Amino acid sequence: NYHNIWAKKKKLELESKGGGNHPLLVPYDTLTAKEKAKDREKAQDIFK
């Protein structure tokens, strides 16, 4: 929910751009775990 409303802001950017193609984007629904730790150490702590 959190990081995909963020990535939906990014998706609205790419929609308004007219379909770009630049590497600097991964939404959270299919995010590799290399950039997820900064989100993990609060998203698991709220659940703790």
Binding site: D29, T30, L31, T32, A33
Partner: peptide, 29 residues
């Protein structure tokens, strides 16, 4: 090993639902 193996199948699923072109889902299978 377990970073983002399973989500590729979800991507291929979402493609397979609305796959307009023929002979394209057949190679995604």
């Amino acid at each position: 090993c377990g970073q983002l193996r399973p989500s590729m199948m979800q991507h291929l699923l979402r493609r397979l639902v609305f796959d307009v072109p023929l002979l394209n889902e057949h190679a995604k299978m």
